[PDB]
């Protein structure tokens, strides 16, 4: 390249969906009910066989506090409009938005077995946990430390990036962080608002009817529900629970088979907990530097240069709406360092001289906003003969009186 510069001309602001699971449901096995459920001889059953229940329940308590730590690391980073729409993404007073309830209604149908049955038999009363574990073979689902109300409140707190600076000035400052001046936003605000609103309309159409983006959240919750239902299936159809109905060998083969099924459940839940921890670490990284700050990385928060992001609280997950800036229609323009006029060399004050073929303009380096060459845009230093790649043009003085 001798004298040529590649400059973008058009731009598209686009939103993208990033769904990351951050929490697994809590399971706890109540001892002295899993073993000797209805044998009514719970001394000799809990002596030889009852010491292996607490070993598994310790691991379930460990993965439960690990998932609570995951939700605390993701959703609790902080403690506490214009031409854009923002009506479907903000809370509308049960303190949830219109993307949040679509996510909740689509993801809560991924479970249809043990968890929904426990929620139905709970009766919205937390004092019946001794009763609800009696009829479901001793398996209990603990509620999380951070409830749905607190997660929704923390999401509403983290949605303070839409703030005492007004929102168009914030978008202008984020464009200035990208590398384009504020005149591009303030002169193309209607097109940007239309693209953002149409992108929210497309995200609502593509999140609800088709699965589309909900293929990495529905399947992991479905895997968790199937792993819990297979425990009840292999606890009821074969190796059944102790009911009212020499024979120590039979009760030994019933109490050893039901323990091994639980050990299978813990062993294949620990790997799922590791995968959820990796996803939660990715979510904490994507909320530390895409939310609560513009990111300098490329193609990490979203496709193109990252501009903004909004968090949303999905059940057992987090939904990031990434707002990004995609350049398009690159053009090759002819560059020149300085311009000679009246025997005086003029250098650009802030920008690059460009030529589109016939006329000469002063533009920014990262965008094609043509400005006519005046004396308020160039400064004078040196003579004509010293600059190597000089070009002939006329600088237009704004003072042209009668």
């Amino acid at each position: 390249s001798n004298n040529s510069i590649a400059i973008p001309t058009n731009f598209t602001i686009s939103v993208t969906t990033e769904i990351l699971p951050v929490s697994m449901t809590k399971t706890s096995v109540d001892c002295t009910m899993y073993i000797c459920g209805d044998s009514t001889e719970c001394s000799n059953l809990l002596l030889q066989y009852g010491s292996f229940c607490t070993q598994l329940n310790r691991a379930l308590t460990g993965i439960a506090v690990e998932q609570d730590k995951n939700t605390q690391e993701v959703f609790a980073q902080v403690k506490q409009f214009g031409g854009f729409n923002f009506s479907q993404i903000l809370p509308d007073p049960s303190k949830r938005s219109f993307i949040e309830d679509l996510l909740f209604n689509k993801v809560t149908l991924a479970d249809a077995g043990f968890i929904k049955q426990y929620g139905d038999c709970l009766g919205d009363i937390a004092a019946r946990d001794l009763i609800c574990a009696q009829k479901f073979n001793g398996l209990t689902v603990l509620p999380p430390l951070l409830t749905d109300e607190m997660i929704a409140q923390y999401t509403s707190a983290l949605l303070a990036g839409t703030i005492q600076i007004p929102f168009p000035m914030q978008m202008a400052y984020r464009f200035e962080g990208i590398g384009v001046t504020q005149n591009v936003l303030y002169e193309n605000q209607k097109l940007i608002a239309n693209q953002f609103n149409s992108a929210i309309g497309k995200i609502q159409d593509s999140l609800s009817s088709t699965p589309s983006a909900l293929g990495k959240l529905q399947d992991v919750v479905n895997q968790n529900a199937q792993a819990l239902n297979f425990l009840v299936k292999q606890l009821s159809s074969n190796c059944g629970a102790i009911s009212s109905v020499e024979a120590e060998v039979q009760i030994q083969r019933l109490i050893t088979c039901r323990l091994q099924s639980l050990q299978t459940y813990v062993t294949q839940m620990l790997i799922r907990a590791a995968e959820y921890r990796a996803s939660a670490n990715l979510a904490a990284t994507k909320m530390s530097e895409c939310v609560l700050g513009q990111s300098k990385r490329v193609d990490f928060c979203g496709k193109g240069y990252h501009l903004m992001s909004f968090p949303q609280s999905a059940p057992h997950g987090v939904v990031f709406l990434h707002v990004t800036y995609v350049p398009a229609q690159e053009k090759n323009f002819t560059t020149a360092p300085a311009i000679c006029h009246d025997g005086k060399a003029h250098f650009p004050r802030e920008g690059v001289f460009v030529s589109n073929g016939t006329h000469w303009f002063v533009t920014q380096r990262n965008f094609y906003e043509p400005q006519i060459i005046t004396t308020d845009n160039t400064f004078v230093s040196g003579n004509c003969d010293v600059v190597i790649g000089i070009v002939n043009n006329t600088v237009y003085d704004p003072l042209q009186p009668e």
Epitope: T264, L270, I271, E275
Partner: antibody, heavy 112, light 109 residues
Framework: QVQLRESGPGLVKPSETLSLTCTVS????????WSWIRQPPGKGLEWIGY???????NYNPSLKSRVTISVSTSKNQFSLNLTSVTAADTAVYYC??????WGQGTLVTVSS | EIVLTQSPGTLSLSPGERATLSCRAS???????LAWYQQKPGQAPRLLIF???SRAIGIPDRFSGSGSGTDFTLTISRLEAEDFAVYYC?????????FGQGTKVEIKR
């Protein structure tokens, strides 16, 4: 209880492919994690990869470029294939369910 | 990869004594993402302690696990002659699962 039995070729030439199958008797490949873990003779254990029934294929990020693990439509088998097998890949391959209930190993020598 | 190193590479202990085996990780792994295995000569590995201290089913009260962070211990109390094995420590927390070089436990008579 579940039973894991491994089978496959005992000797392969270099620059060929392994095809090790693992028969699951007493259980089904429907909702559990399954992994392959190998061992050079007189050395430690090295982990190849684990899969789920519907998806989630995770392999080792030192052997990822030449490995594939796949379930079978018979609902009782899954297979491990390697590519560009050098002489340093001879091992006693082990078939496991997550990290519990391993199976007996199959020794795969690789020499011409 | 998180490299797991076992420092007492080979022991030689009489029956009735204790055996303390140490597994050390380069990075801080959690308490719930480590496991222990024993390997008899010419056999498959057998899970002994998953998580830090949770015993499996079919294992006596001799084998006890402890530790959190970058220092994990396996304790064998009242060792018998049927414990001639190679013992391995395993991480299933990070995506590249890493074992270690084993500890070979001998019996002295």
């Amino acid at each position: 209880q579940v039973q894991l039995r491994e089978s496959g070729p005992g000797l392969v030439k270099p620059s060929e492919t392994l095809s090790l199958t693992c028969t699951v008797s007493g259980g089904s490949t429907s909702g559990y994690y399954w992994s392959w873990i190998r061992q050079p003779p007189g050395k430690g254990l090295e982990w190849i990869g684990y899969i789920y029934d519907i998806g989630s294929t995770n392999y080792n990020p030192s052997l990822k470029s030449r490995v594939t693990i796949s379930v079978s439509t018979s609902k009782n088998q899954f297979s491990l294939n390697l590519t560009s097998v050098t002489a340093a890949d001879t091992a006693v391959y082990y078939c496991a369910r997550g990290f519990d209930s391993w199976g007996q190993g199959t020794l795969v020598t690789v020499s011409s | 990869e998180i490299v797991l190193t076992q420092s007492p590479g080979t022991l030689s202990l009489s029956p009735g004594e204790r055996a303390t085996l140490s597994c050390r990780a380069s990075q801080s792994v959690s308490s719930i993402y480590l496991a222990w295995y024993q390997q008899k000569p010419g056999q498959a590995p057998r899970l002994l302690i998953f998580a830090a201290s949770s015993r499996a089913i079919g294992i006596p009260d001799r084998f006890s696990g402890s530790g959190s962070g970058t220092d994990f211990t396996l304790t064998i109390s009242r060792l018998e002659a049927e414990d001639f094995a190679v013992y391995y420590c395993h991480q299933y927390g990070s995506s590249p699962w890493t074992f270690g070089q084993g500890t070979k436990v001998e019996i002295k008579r």
